[PDB]
Design a protein around this ligand. Sequence first.
Ligand code: FAD
Ligand code: FAD
Ligand code: NAD
Ligand code: NAD
Ligand code: MG
Ligand code: MG
Ligand code: MG
Ligand code: MG
Ligand code: MG
Ligand code: MG
Ligand code: MG
Ligand code: MG
Lengths: 493, 492
Amino acid sequence: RKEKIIILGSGWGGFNFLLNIDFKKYDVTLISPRNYFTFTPLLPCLCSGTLSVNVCTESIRNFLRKKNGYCGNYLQLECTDVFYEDKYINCIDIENNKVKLFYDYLIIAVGAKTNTFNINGVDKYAYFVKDIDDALKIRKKFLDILEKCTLPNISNEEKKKMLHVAVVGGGPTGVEVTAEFADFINKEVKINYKDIFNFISISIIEGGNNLLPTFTQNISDFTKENFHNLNINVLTNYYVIDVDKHSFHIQSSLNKNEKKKLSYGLLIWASGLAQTTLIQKFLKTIPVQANNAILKVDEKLRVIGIPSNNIYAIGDCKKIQPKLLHEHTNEIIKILTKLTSEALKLKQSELTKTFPQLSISKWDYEKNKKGEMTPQQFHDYLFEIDKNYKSPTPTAQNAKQEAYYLSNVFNNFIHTNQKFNIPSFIEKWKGSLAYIGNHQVVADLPYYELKGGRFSSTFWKVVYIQLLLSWKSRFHFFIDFIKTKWYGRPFIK
Amino acid sequence: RKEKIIILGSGWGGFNFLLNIDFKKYDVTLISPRNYFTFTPLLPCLCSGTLSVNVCTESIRNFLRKKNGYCGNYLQLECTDVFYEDKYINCIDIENNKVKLFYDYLIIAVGAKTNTFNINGVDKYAYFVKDIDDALKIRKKFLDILEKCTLPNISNEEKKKMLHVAVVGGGPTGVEVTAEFADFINKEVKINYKDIFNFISISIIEGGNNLLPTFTQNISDFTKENFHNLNINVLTNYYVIDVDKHSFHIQSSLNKNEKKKLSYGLLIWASGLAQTTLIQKFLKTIPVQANNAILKVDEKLRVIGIPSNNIYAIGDCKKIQPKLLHEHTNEIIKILKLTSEALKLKQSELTKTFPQLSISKWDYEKNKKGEMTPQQFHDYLFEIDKNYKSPTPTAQNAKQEAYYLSNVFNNFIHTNQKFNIPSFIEKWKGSLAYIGNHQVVADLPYYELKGGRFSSTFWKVVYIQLLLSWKSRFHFFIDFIKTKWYGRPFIK
Ligand SMILES: Cc1cc2nc3c(=O)[nH]c(=O)nc-3n(C[C@H](O)[C@H](O)[C@H](O)COP(=O)(O)OP(=O)(O)OC[C@H]3O[C@@H](n4cnc5c(N)ncnc54)[C@H](O)[C@@H]3O)c2cc1C
Ligand SMILES: Cc1cc2nc3c(=O)[nH]c(=O)nc-3n(C[C@H](O)[C@H](O)[C@H](O)COP(=O)(O)OP(=O)(O)OC[C@H]3O[C@@H](n4cnc5c(N)ncnc54)[C@H](O)[C@@H]3O)c2cc1C
Ligand SMILES: NC(=O)c1ccc[n+]([C@@H]2O[C@H](COP(=O)([O-])OP(=O)(O)OC[C@H]3O[C@@H](n4cnc5c(N)ncnc54)[C@H](O)[C@@H]3O)[C@@H](O)[C@H]2O)c1
Ligand SMILES: NC(=O)c1ccc[n+]([C@@H]2O[C@H](COP(=O)([O-])OP(=O)(O)OC[C@H]3O[C@@H](n4cnc5c(N)ncnc54)[C@H](O)[C@@H]3O)[C@@H](O)[C@H]2O)c1
Ligand SMILES: [Mg+2]
Ligand SMILES: [Mg+2]
Ligand SMILES: [Mg+2]
Ligand SMILES: [Mg+2]
Ligand SMILES: [Mg+2]
Ligand SMILES: [Mg+2]
Ligand SMILES: [Mg+2]
Ligand SMILES: [Mg+2]
């Protein structure tokens, strides 16, 4: 008779919600086709053999018994439909048997998938890099190619075509995967495959001018410089537009007329995100959202358009559409002293609990001061703040923070003295890191920039050994680096 | 213009030959469809998640440069034919492209495969345990089943049938794989799957009366006792005769007409050896060996029936057929009045020619004979010949053969010792087995281990020395810490 919370997904959102939700207060079931949590930041290290599967993983069933003594459940299913009207979901097991399950609360955390842009042959020929098996598939293919090119039944020009590694995407994923392959190629591969080492080349391809565009221009320039010193072909300002079995095509971003055909052996696709079929389906089911491209939620992470307000979504599968300021103008006016921008800002602490977009991290009050306004003008101003609101970026950092917010809201606000005092979710940006090869780490932190150096790696390791969610994983983190330092990357495939 | 040695296979034989063969003296190429060496004794620990792949493995290319500066080569191919007349072999890559290669010496070390005994459904439905991939497939299937049986769309009756693990074979492989699963089931699985744990059962099936037949009766009895304490169904004196998708059939060894149909979820097949298709093919190519079931070699490991004497075989793919004593009677008489004790007295030196004369191959005291006539001596010699047993198909023997033969190439073949090449004689060092719940058994010369608090410690001290790199020793040590402090993983 405890209320049932179903969690869909075992990713950063779902798993972290699981870790914090009170199993005494609720009856909790996580549902996911994947029986482990994947620690995605270390996924590129898996591509090169620097770290093991154990450090990139947490098994869900190890976290189903909290110290209180009460338990949670886990089912290995893939949710295929949500029926918000009747409070249930349809799933399928791995043998396509339907399973029907009821909930009182649904926490959707199914994440996003890799975007092919409908380009011909991305699904067919390219390797994605979004989970454990993806990374392992990529490692093996690479090692497979190395062995195939050591055979005598092969010409030097066949070798040059096949030993070309193309990475599409100059975001952090693409950049880190390239970096890691570069280290592998310049170390272990160089030693054990000398006769063919010089036919090997890596290219990274990016539509815009900069690698790591969302970081900072100095970090971008440094990343490109460092890539040059590693003899990585940096093909920025190029868009991949077609993919065939042995070659792909690129179009210059600077001249629409300039195309190139490139040979390749291994093609890694690390472009942006796209929605799961479950989300596409679910959207059609909600009158208000029937033609949305992504699932929209409250400022409280409630899925808009559900009469019951019993479905939440966290992580990559959702954008936040908060309660509009300009729909509550008069009410906000009463709350104030004047009627200036800094009248508003003076009450920004209190009003931020209701409107996230009022946050000093969401609205620049100084780049936008406004002298005394008439009510209508104030309403226009409020409207600008509304339009300026940016939904949290699709990162593990945000998914984790959303997961702790929401679970704590279930633990401490719903079904307690505070049912109505629930604050709206606001991220704190903690910074971003990236490995860019050859011991060089970059970090774009709130008050710092790292641009390489002897102690860059050290900073990276102190950061991530603390972001790991178990002592088991910390053990492996430590051991795996010793092993890689003393003995090297492995060639088992 | 260095002579070319081609090694076929990257197992205990091939890899250890590679480790010791002098790359300065020869131009060596190992050919194997598998680019790593598999440390098979720890393979059952891989089934249960106790140890990792890193401790069961060595990557061939890490060993292609010895410290003197000379190199070896490796090619990822599967040999499909040997043409002994013309000294070349045909291979195929993984995309079925033919490759043709010339050698001066061929070292065949392709091992053996699992024997299905042609039984319907073994290949189709059963899991084998001969390599890394096998162990991981086995591990996954089990975890798959546990998850499937936690679903609601499943009856307790379906659960009981699906969560039955049957292991066919009471040899050390079968026994060790059963033990490891028992440990996993009784620890990590019991904690994380309380609801369905009592639907789980393990059976081991063995045709003879004993588990670990080739050990000791005390060790066999102790292994069976320990198995019952763990609630493993020990179905000795049963053999499997048929296999279907959800059930298999067994026949009593004690009553020809008692049969049983058993349901199962996971069927593991560890029944003993059979020959590779390469060896079957190659045999038909050798006139004197054309109807053999197994490849026979000299007492010097040279494949018999080859005019050039440039093809060797080591490991599980071969049996030794030594030079016959009774074909050399008169000569032996001349070396030596004319008793078994006379013969034994010269046994150390004659053993360099005939391995069957070894005190480890022939019981001189249980077979003493007084003065013989030449004819009688000839008959005696003949008994020694027929008593000879080829090395048992073990890693221990494949390794010892590989060190012997590589040492012959290094220090005999192109030196002034060409003619004093001694015949190969194993030295048995003992055998160990993990039998679950921390109990190790060992059947050593002069000792028997039957369990104990310090049983496991002995096992760990032995195998950390048997590992062939410091890398692997690191992982050996670390993997046991990991398993102790944090437990076995459920990743699949
Ligand atoms: C290589 C890589 C490196 C990254 N590094 C960083 C980083 O350093 N910092 C950072 O902030 N972010 C990083 N990210 C981004 C981060 O992984 C995502 O933002 C994060 O995964 C969002 O979490 P999520 O729970 O929404 O989705 P996921 O973590 O992808 O989880 C989705 C889960 O839903 C499951 N699922 C899918 N379909 C269904 C279905 N219909 N039913 C039930 N379950 C389903 C999946 O199995 C999965 O378990 C990285 C991403 C990648 C790919
Ligand atoms: C689970 C298990 C545990 C064991 N434990 C022990 C133990 O504790 N002690 C002990 O003494 N023995 C043990 N053994 C036995 C030991 O593994 C074998 O006796 C040993 O492998 C024999 O070595 P080999 O080189 O002849 O064959 P393998 O080690 O099997 O090597 C054969 C190699 O040949 C390759 N190959 C196959 N076909 C071809 C082809 N056509 N062309 C080229 N290469 C080919 C294979 O890929 C493989 O690399 C165990 C065996 C198993 C399965
Ligand atoms: N180290 C970190 O902190 C880290 C690491 C990985 C991911 N993340 C987060 O995960 C999310 C996704 O990251 P991501 O790297 O996979 O995607 P991304 O959107 O950040 O980068 C994709 C890049 O590929 C380009 N692109 C798209 N289609 C292309 C084409 N056809 N040809 C060439 N270039 C093309 C885009 O211009 C874009 O710059 C991001 O929000 C990111 O911040 C963070
Ligand atoms: N711990 C160790 O030292 C160790 C471990 C594994 C293997 N080995 C060596 O590797 C070789 C192979 O060992 P193995 O265990 O794989 O095979 P095995 O030959 O030693 O034993 C197989 C057993 O299964 C039985 N069997 C065969 N077909 C059957 C059927 N249809 N139904 C029921 N029982 C059936 C046989 O009676 C036999 O005892 C051996 O030489 C062994 O010594 C040693
Ligand atoms: Mg999730
Ligand atoms: Mg994840
Ligand atoms: Mg999500
Ligand atoms: Mg996602
Ligand atoms: Mg071999
Ligand atoms: Mg082997
Ligand atoms: Mg062999
Ligand atoms: Mg074999």
